[PDB]
Amino acid sequence: ENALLRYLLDK
Amino acid sequence: KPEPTDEEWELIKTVTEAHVATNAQGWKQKRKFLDLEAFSHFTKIITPAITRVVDFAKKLPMFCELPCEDQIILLKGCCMEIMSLRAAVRYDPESETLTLNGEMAVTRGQLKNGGLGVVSDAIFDLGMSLSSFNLDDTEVALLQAVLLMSSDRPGLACVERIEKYQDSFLLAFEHYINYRKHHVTHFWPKLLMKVTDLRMIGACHASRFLHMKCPTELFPPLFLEVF
Numbered sequence A: 001e002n003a004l005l006r007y008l009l010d011k
Numbered sequence B: 001k002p003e004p005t006d007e008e009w010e011l012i013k014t015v016t017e018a019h020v021a022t023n024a025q026g027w028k029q030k031r032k033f034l035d036l037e038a039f040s041h042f043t044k045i046i047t048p049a050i051t052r053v054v055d056f057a058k059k060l061p062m063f064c065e066l067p068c069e070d071q072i073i074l075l076k077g078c079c080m081e082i083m084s085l086r087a088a089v090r091y092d093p094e095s096e097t098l099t100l101n102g103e104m105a106v107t108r109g110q111l112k113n114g115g116l117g118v119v120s121d122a123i124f125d126l127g128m129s130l131s132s133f134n135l136d137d138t139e140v141a142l143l144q145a146v147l148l149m150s151s152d153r154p155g156l157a158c159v160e161r162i163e164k165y166q167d168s169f170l171l172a173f174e175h176y177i178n179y180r181k182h183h184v185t186h187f188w189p190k191l192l193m194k195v196t197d198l199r200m201i202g203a204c205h206a207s208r209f210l211h212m213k214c215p216t217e218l219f220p221p222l223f224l225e226v227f
């Protein structure tokens, strides 16, 4: 999970 | 009283510009004064506020040197604390309002009945006491960096770098306070007590979230991913 957060962090 | 070193001025420069670049407006001239229906109106303005916090962390090189799962844990832990501090420093005693997203004045009662409960009181009382502190963009930025680099967040892997980063910020932020000579006694001890207050707010957002979980679909997806 945390897919949206992980997208915003990986630019 | 030791004043900042050269390397600490550079760290202050980085964190202050990161904060200013991700802090909405800069607000009292934009304010738009304002029960799942109040909860809906609040859920649907929160995703920009969470994203600004993400952009602030990404502008800190020490944060970028961490693995993405520690990065995720670190945002999830400090997101509401930073958003609460940013609203508390925008307390207007004449209107008794906080400013959300740089343009939305809210009252104690509006924000409480919007879903935060007694956490609304805690943020408002924090904004009241922060008036006589006269914090600038730098002192707020450093507060956000201290909260972000919390090595006690559950699940972290680089516990001992994160605690080193925080110790760096904590020292540069104390020397800045020495350099700045606020007309308040025992200022650095009182600031550390405010860090405790914001950490209390962070864990009480969490309790209020479990209480609110209303169908999960009605909660926006980033709001769900933070908690």
Ligand SMILES: COc1nc(C(=O)NCC(=O)O)c(O)c2ccc(Oc3ccc4ccccc4c3)cc12
Pocket (backbone or CB within 6 Å): B023, B024, B042, B043, B045, B046, B049, B080, B082, B083, B084, B086, B087, B099, B100, B101, B102, B114, B115, B116, B205, B206, B208, B209, B212
């Ligand atoms: C921290 O409180 C806020 N601050 C801002 C903001 O902009 N901060 C100023 C800045 O960053 O400059 C917001 O936009 C907020 C939007 C909605 C909000 O409602 C909530 C939030 C969390 C909840 C947890 C559990 C139950 C109910 C809840 C309701 C709070 C906001």
